[PDB]
Amino acid sequence: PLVGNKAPDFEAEAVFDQEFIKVKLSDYIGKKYVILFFYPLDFTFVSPTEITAFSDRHSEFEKLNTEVLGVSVDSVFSHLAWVQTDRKSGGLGDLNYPLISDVTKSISKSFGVLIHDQGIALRGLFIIDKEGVIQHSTINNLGIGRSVDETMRTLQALQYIQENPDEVCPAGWKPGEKSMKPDPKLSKEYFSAI
Amino acid sequence: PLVGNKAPDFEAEAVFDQEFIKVKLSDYIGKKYVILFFYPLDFTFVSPTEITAFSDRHSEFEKLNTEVLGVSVDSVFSHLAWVQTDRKSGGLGDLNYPLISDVTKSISKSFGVLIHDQGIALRGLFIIDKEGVIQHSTINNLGIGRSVDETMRTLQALQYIQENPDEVCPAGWKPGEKSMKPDPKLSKEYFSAIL
Amino acid sequence: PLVGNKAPDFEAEAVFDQEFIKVKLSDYIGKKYVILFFYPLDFTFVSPTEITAFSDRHSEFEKLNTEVLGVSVDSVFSHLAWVQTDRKSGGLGDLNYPLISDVTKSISKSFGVLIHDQGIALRGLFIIDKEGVIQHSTINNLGIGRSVDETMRTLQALQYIQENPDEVCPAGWKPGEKSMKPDPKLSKEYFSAI
Amino acid sequence: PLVGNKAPDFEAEAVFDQEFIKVKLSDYIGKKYVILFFYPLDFTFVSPTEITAFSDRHSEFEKLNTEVLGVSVDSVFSHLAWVQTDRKSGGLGDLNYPLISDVTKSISKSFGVLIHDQGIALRGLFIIDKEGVIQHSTINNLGIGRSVDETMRTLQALQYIQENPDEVCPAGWKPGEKSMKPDPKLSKEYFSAIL
Amino acid sequence: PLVGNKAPDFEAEAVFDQEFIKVKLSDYIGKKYVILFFYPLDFTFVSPTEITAFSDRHSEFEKLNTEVLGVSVDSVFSHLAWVQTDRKSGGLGDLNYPLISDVTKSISKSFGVLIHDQGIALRGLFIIDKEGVIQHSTINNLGIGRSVDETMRTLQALQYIQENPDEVCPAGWKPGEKSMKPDPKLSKEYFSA
Amino acid sequence: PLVGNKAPDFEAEAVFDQEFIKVKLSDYIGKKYVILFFYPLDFTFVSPTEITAFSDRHSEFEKLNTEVLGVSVDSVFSHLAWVQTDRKSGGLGDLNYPLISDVTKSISKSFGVLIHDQGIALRGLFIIDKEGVIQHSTINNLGIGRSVDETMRTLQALQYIQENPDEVCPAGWKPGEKSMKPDPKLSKEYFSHHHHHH
Amino acid sequence: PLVGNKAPDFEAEAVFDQEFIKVKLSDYIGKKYVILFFYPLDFTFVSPTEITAFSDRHSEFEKLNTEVLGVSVDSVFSHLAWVQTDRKSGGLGDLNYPLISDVTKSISKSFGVLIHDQGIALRGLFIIDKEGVIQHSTINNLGIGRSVDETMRTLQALQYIQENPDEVCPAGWKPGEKSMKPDPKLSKEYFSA
Amino acid sequence: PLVGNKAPDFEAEAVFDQEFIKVKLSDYIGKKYVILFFYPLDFTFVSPTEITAFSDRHSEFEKLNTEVLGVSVDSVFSHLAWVQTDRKSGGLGDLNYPLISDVTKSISKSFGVLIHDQGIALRGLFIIDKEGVIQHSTINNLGIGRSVDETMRTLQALQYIQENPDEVCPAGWKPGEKSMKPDPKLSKEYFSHHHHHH
Amino acid sequence: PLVGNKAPDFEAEAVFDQEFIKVKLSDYIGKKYVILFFYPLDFTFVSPTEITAFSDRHSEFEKLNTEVLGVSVDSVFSHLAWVQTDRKSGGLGDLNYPLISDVTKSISKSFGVLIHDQGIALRGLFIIDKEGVIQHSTINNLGIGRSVDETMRTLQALQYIQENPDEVCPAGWKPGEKSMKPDPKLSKEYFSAIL
Amino acid sequence: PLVGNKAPDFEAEAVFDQEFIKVKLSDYIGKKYVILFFYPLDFTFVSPTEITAFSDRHSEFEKLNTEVLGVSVDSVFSHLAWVQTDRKSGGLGDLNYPLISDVTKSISKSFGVLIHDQGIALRGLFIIDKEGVIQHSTINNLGIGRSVDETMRTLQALQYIQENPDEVCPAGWKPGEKSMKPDPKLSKEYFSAIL
DSSP, X not given: OOTTSBOOOOEXXXXXTTEXXXXXXXXXXXXXXXXXXXXXXXXXXXXXXXXXXXXXXXXXXXXXXXXXXXXXXXXXHXXXXXXXXXGGGTOOOXXXXXXXXXXTOHHHHHTTOEETTXXXXXXEEEEEOTTSBEEEEEEEOTTBOXXXXXXXXXXXXXXXXXXXXXXXXXXXXXXXXXXXXXXXXXTHHHXXXX | OOTTSBOOOOEEEEEETTEEEEEEGGGGTTTOEEEEXXXXXXXXXXXXXXXXXXXXTHHHXXXXXXXXXXXXXXXXXXXXXXXXXXXXXXXXXXXXXXXXXXXXXXXXXXXXXXXXXXXXXXXXXXEEOTTSBEEEEEEEOTTBXXXXXXXXXXXXXXXXXXXXXXXXXXXXXXXXXXXXXXXXTTHHHHHTTOO | OOTTSBOOOOEEEEEETTEEEEEEGGGGTTTOEEEXXXXXXXXXXXXXXXXHHHHHTHHHHHHTTEEEEEEESSOHHHHHHHHTSOGGGTOOOSOSSOXXXXXXXXXXXXXXXXXXTTTEEOEEEEEEOTTSBEEEEEEEOTTBOOOHHHHHHHHHHHHHHHHSTTXXXXXXXXXXXXXXXXXXXXXXXXXXXX | OOTTXXXXXXXXXXXXTTEEEEEEGGGGTTTOEEEEEEOSOSSOSHHHHHHHHHHHTHHHHHHTXXXXXXXXXXXXXXXXXXXXXXXXXXXXXXXXXXXXXXXXXXXXXXXXXXXXXXXXXXXXXXXXXXXXXXXXXXXXXTTBOOOHHHHHHHHHHHHHHHHSTTOBBOTTOOTTSOOBOSSTTXXXXXXXXXX | OOTTSBOOOOEEEEEETTEEEEEEGGGGTTTOEEEEEEOSOSSOSHHHHHHHHHHHTHHHHHTTTEEEEEXXXXXXXXXXXXXXXXXGGTOOOSOSSOEEEOTTSHHHHHTTXXXXXXXXXXXXXXXXXXXXXXXXXXXXXXXXXXXXXXXHHHHHHHHHHHHSTTOBBOTTOOTTSOOBOSSTTTTHHHHHO | OOTTSBOOOOEEEEEETTEEEEEEGGGGTTTOEEEEEEOSOSSOSHHHHHHHHHHHTHHHHHTTTEEEEEEESSOHHHHHXXXXXXXXXXXXXXXXXXXXXXXXXXXXXXXXXXXXXXXXXXXXXXXXXXXXXXXXXXXXXXXXXXXXXXXXHHHHHHHHHHHSTTOBBOTTOOTTSOOBOOOOOBOTTTOOOOGGGO | OOTXXXXXXXXXXXXXXXXXXXXXXXXXXXXXXXXXXXXXXXXXXXXXXXXXXXXXXXXHHHTTTEEEEEEESSOHHHHHHXXXXXXXXXXXXXXXXXXXXXXXXXXXXXXXXEETTTTEEOEXXXXXXXXXXXXEEEEEOTTBOOOHXXXXXXXXXHHHHHHSTTOBBOTTOOTTSXXXXXXXXXXXXXXXX | OOTTSBOOOOEEEEEXXXXXXXXXXXXXXXXXXXXXXXXXXXXXXXXXXXXXXXXXXXXXHHTTTEEEEEEESSOHHHHHHHHTSOGGGTOOOSOSSOEEXXXXXXXXXXXXXXXXXXXXXXXXXXXXXXXSBEEEEEEEOTTBOOXXXXXXXXXXXXXXXXXXXXXXXXXXXXXXXXXXXXXXXXXXXXXXXXXXXX | OOTTSBOXXXXXXXXXTTXXXXXXXXXXXXXXXXXXXEOSOTTOSHHHHXXXXXXXXXHXXXXXXXXXEEEESSOHHHHHHHHTSOGGGTOOOSOSSOEEEOTTOHHHHXXXXXXXXXXXXXXXXXXXXXXXXXXXXXXXXXXXXXXXXXXXXXXXXXXXXXXXXXXXXXXXXXXXXXXXOSSTTTTHHHHTTOO | OOTTSBOOOOEEEEEETTEEEEEEGGGGTTTOEEEEEEOSOTTOSHHHHHHHHHHHTHHHHHHTTEEEEEEESSXXXXXXXXXXXXXXXXXXXXXXXXXXXXXXXXXXXHTTOXXXXXXXXXXXXXXXOTTSBEEEEEEEOTTBOOOHHHXXXXXXXXXXXXXXXXXXXXXXXXXXXOOBOSSTTTTHHHHTTOO
16 A cells, blocks of 8 residues: 555646745655655646645644645646636636646646546545655545644654654544543553543 | 545445454445544554543444444454453443454555554544545654544534535534535625624 | 647637537538637637637638637636636637637646646647648747637638649748649759749 | 658768768758658659759759758669650759659658658658758648748748747748747746737 | 475464464474374364364473474454453363464465365364474374373373384384384394284 | 365275275265274374274264275275285284275365375375264374374264354363353344354 | 468568559459569669569460569659659659559568568569469579579479479470489389480 | 578488488578478479479579579388489489478478468479578479579579679569669769669 | 387378378378387488388288378488389389388477487387287397397287277297286286296 | 486395395395395285295305395385295295385385386396496286296396397307307307308
8 A cells, every 4th residue: 555655756837826836755755754745737726725724724734844746637837827817717826835846747647536537636635744655545436525623633642653653543533632642551542541 | 635535335244243243344335424433553552542532432433324434453352352451451341332343454554544553543633424434633652642523523514514515614614604506706705704 | 649640639619609519620620620729718818819800811711611619727617717708808709610628637648748747738739630640730838829820820821732632832922822743753853033 | 750860871872963972860960940741652753853953943942051852762773864854844953952762662661651652752841950850740731732931941940940049930830920939927928919 | 295204494473472473494403293183173173173173282392392383373462352252151261372373374385284275274283303304294184183192192202202212103102112223133023022 | 174175075996805896986975974084004003903993893983883994005906915915914904894994085185184295195084974064073193093082072072063053162061061042133134053062 | 381382471562564553462363373483672773674574575475374463662652753753864754564562561570571670571582373373483682683584484384383283393404305204113204215 | 481591400310412411501601592492292293304404404593603492291212202203203313402491391381381181282383591680582383394494594683683783683584684783873972772673 | 118109190291102192191090000100211321121021011010000100300202212112222123111211300209210410310119009009129239130039029919909998018028928817806817827 | 217327325224044134136246146136015915935036046146246135115014024935925035135015115216117006116136246237127917926947047138248248149149158258350259150
């Protein structure tokens, strides 16, 4: 599986602050967590709500040492045209993170989210830790938007267990909730408490 | 990819009501939505919290015409032993849904959740509709527990767009929130309504 | 070669009069000549000048029983967004012919104009006769715009020799110019005249 | 595709000034632009009009640092026989550029213009820059003559954008017309200037 | 065949004294004989009688410089749960030897005891000498328990012929019985009696 | 694996009552249990003690509806020459069961007991039930003789659990000892002899 | 080998009487012997002497129920241009037999006369009987012209042995010379003389 | 094709002066032209007339720095038996050149004259120049004898154009007839013996 | 092995009574035993002595329902020339049996006696019964001639056991000698009389 | 073919003087001629007569620098049991040469005498010279015993021509008989004396 292993590296053109840049995924290793989400096409319907939802809460991810990266098979010129469209008109407005262009579809293919039939990507999202290892996947069919909240929760759980490597996070864990020690003897400390 | 296609069928033994039964995944086609979640091993730590979290809210899924199915590579005798252990002792107590045994590991293989190094499954969860099609995938590494709330949300979004085939669900959609029509002309109806 | 043989058939989504339609190339067989031109990407620079140039002279092609079809690897949503952009802003405005979407890149691949490196098509143009046979190719690198005039000339020559199957068109032939009979004995009638 | 890449090199005999010479395509790299055009056969009909049309305007290409090269599958003895036939008799008369013999058909094969059924080349024309890279392709079926004017236009556009690497040539561009900068911000300078 | 050759080596997790340890089979080479037995699954019926049967007599095997190793496809968490159950409740109680986990099933596969249809091992038992060579195999279908007595007999025969490499053991040989020299001329001393 | 599946069928010549006969293994299906044991070579040392040991107790197996079959890679002419040798001279004397000749070695090969290096069989023994399914394997290296007593115990346990299909035999079970009637709880929808075997 | 077997059939365009025709080699089966000769290229030097040499003596071959076919890799347009040139200007003038175009080079390839390096045929000549069988091959390198006399001699020998199938032709046989019967006992009549 | 390229080399036993010798074809390179002719079998009918015809005119070839070599699939013992047979009896008598034995048939095979159906060679003749390059081929079916006169003509034409490397021989050329000095117009940059050959 | 199986069939031209015939090996099945011997080459040295030895004793084989067949890779014309050569001159003289020509060497190849290095056959001899099955092979290197006496003995033993299918022939068996019954209990008749 | 080439080497256990030895065929190279004969099985019927026939005349072969080697697929224990059986009882009695055991059947396989159907060897016999090259093979089907006399004759002829490398042995050659020189002109000495 992809989860539990190093992410497939890529180097691609992207749009950031309405300028054309390059983004190399491995360049974030050692530096930040990465939330990499794919969406099907520019100028669609669920996709702008996801993209701007993540843009509006980007400060929360930046303060948690996490970068957000959006990817679709569109070119950087579609990306740029869409950034310059008003949100009220179905556009994106200005974005707080890079919009990555996968024109060759190799990135979507390497993450297993490419629908070969249609040449577009599913709504797949991947949380990558500072060592470059994929720790989480959410993959939705095209009609169902994802959740910034659940992405935030999963990310906080990952950072929590990586700072306290002797803990694991129970179902529904939030910051402030009790964790547990994955040990037949010490986990009882949790199981008695409830 | 798995999402967007018919689920790989299986027929496997399971523990239900402390009895041994058989479960065939395709038997739910035409009848119920399926939430199929894998966990690594019996007598572990995050896994019991996931299993009982879903069991305690099983009635809510039952009201939504959805069955929950837990799967791991352990045998049905380990499953039965774990159900008969108290929750206070790290056990499951009584379960409201079948615990399926993937003893040959073929089910985990077909859903791409098997860590071949270790012979156990990742924390993969799959939502399957009444036609047997996978519509949602959640896959966590072994240490991070999942969320029954987000599973409930995604399942409800799927049911909404399947009853209203002209709608799609925006980011963060919950029941009661506005959806939109995936049409460049009718989408403006949703878009020109956000201050 | 592609030229001299039946065009590779396709069925694809397209934008026409700002609506989503389907276009099947073989459906024009027996009905009209087809001028099929590929361009690299939506929201570029030479491409809008080519697309609108052909749009403005579309009546000349319609009166000659010829349809124009543009193709790129962009989706119909980019196509539609670009049609709804003003020409003064680098957009296309309203188009007189369909804009075809090759999201899977199979069409560009089958016509041999796909740059595999970049996932976009070269500036290839193909004139297809009423039997579906490719009779002409113009393929330019990305920086050089094509010519509506030379396309018109080549098309008029093709229709001329197909109406008078005993004639062929010399270099630079225009309507009104003398043709010749490709026959060792009758071609002399041309060669003496000049 | 051929366009956008280095041309397939060849070394072949040719007729020039009614003498037998050798021509190596890569020998023009670093020195001149190359217009390489194929024609099907000697002693035919459209082909002599193309060949002499280019010969009569050869001086214009020579002024543009460009050589013209004609190629067909005929031998150099047929080529020489055709040059020595009067134009009034369907011949070539004197030619200003080499006529290359593709007797083994390997050159036509490498440029994708060989009709394998018939063993002759289509009316393919290729523009090659000083680095040896194909920048333009014209391929006609056997009955439709080509245009020296459009070849001149495309060659001049190529030379313009290669001397001005920040420019691109719009549709129908001729020398003296405005070009544009392929940049979403600087392109508006061209676009907001057309009534 | 497996018997007569070096055992397929493995490194696996196991439960011993209610702790998780590692066991590498080649680590016993030069040190002890190994009695390596597979059983199908934890929390079953015949298997606990075999496992505890070997545990109760482990001192007899240890005095013979022999270690016992139990293996099944269950994880160490099932193994530990089963050890921490009393024998009266269907458990194993405390064991005198390691319970090995073959969670990937590769060990059962390499010893040819994996029923691929069912993903569990047959009741296969292997006697391995100090050089790491398989000398004996007992493989039962799931319903028939094995016998610690016959394992002890076979191990004693193997140890006898390895300490007296010029002897071989006749049918039913027990310590104290006559052996014979596998030689046409010297066997006659045995058959004449 | 071989155990748990139908035995590989064979048809071979054999020595019985000092005459050359044919034996087809599938012919015992429906009729008798089979104790099929291999030994490496004729005129050896452990092998005659095993062979005569089984012949001397053959009546006990006959009363249990069981036939014994010995197999080796020697020909029937070796088998007959060895049967006609006195036991005091290392021979077999007359035997109560057939001695099967595996000259082409395909039989040893199909049962996985052929040492390819040496062209002889290990001391493999196989207990086969009335449906032809191998239920037990004992495979010894060449120097260690087998036990007729343990073969009898395993055979008796197999016959017990097949006659009482709800029972299983614990470790070390002998006739007269308690068996086990396990009670895996299957639902009645599933209920219509697998799980009590583990 | 080609000699002794049916010729590779072909259908090709040719020039005859300054007109474009088609020639299919199997169309001559049952009707005429075929003298099929290849030459390298049109507008050369040895080749016209061979082509016109055969043309000037075509009546001698036609009286023997034999057609001559010339083949080169040039097109019919080169062929026609060369025919319409006078012999005094290096041309062929009018020809008594078809000039075949092997523009795809497949015919030369199938008769093994194609020099692949140069894309032209050697000076190969083949005599084909009324059943379509190759009976004789003459293959020269480019600088040595062939001989119409030896072609006539070989054709006359082949026709002789096919009309008298019990005879064979000795070395240098011409019409009027003694033949022999290929038989150990009847050959003696020949060798005794 | 064979013609225009170096001959396939061979080394074979042969009969010469009623003794067994060896012949290696590459040994003539730099030294003599070679007329290498195959015939199907010894003790036949067209073949002796060809063989004796070449032997009787061998001096004419010797004076032209040319060796003749006959080859067939028969052994040297057949060749010697046939040489020792009188010509009036269908034999060869003594020969002026070696008779080469192709018992393994590799020689006939390398020259493409082996009828695989029958294991014998067609009446193939090959003229090889001093550099070892085949310049001419005549291949007759088994019933048609070849012509020593035409071999002489072709050989003389080859020697002429190789001694006068600017000339070529028209159709039917004989010594004394006009040759041709063609004048293909190559540029002096290209000018430093191909094109006048066509 | 060849011995014990049907001989590889062939059809080949041969010389018999100084005439050309065809010989098909399977045509002797049911009719005669066959002694098929190969020799290396015509006009050699050991081979003529073998061939004439078999011809001189051919009547003894004919009375035993046996044909002799000699085979070498030479043609029928070499064979005929050699038959018409006097024995004092190294020839064969008149032959009582056919001389078969294996020009394509397929026969020598199928009986495994062809020296591929040299294209000739070894001194292999095969005794074939009326059913077409090879019962004996003798294969000598080129310098060691074979023995007609031993061929007659082997043939006579084969005919004996095929006439008395319950008997087998001990070492050195000749007509008049004791046979034995290949049975443990019946062979005692032969064994007990050993002196 | 095997005849004319180095024999396939082997190393095998054998019985000699009622002891177990090892025998390596290449160890006889340079030292002795080898008569290597296969027989089908121990305790059979033709085979003991062959084995004892060779043992009884072994001294004649020993004086000719020749060893005898018998081979069958039986084990050395069958071999020893058979040697220790009386000849009147179908046994061998004491043997003058080694009995080799081919239990894995590789030796019979490499000499082409193994009947794969039955796993036993044919009655194949091979004469091997001091250089290790097979010069003669006799292969009989199971019922026809071989001849020690013909083996001695073939061996004596081989030794004769290897001692006189300019001679070859005609058909039926025995010591004292005329040889011949395999040369067209020298063979006339033999041929001209034919009566």
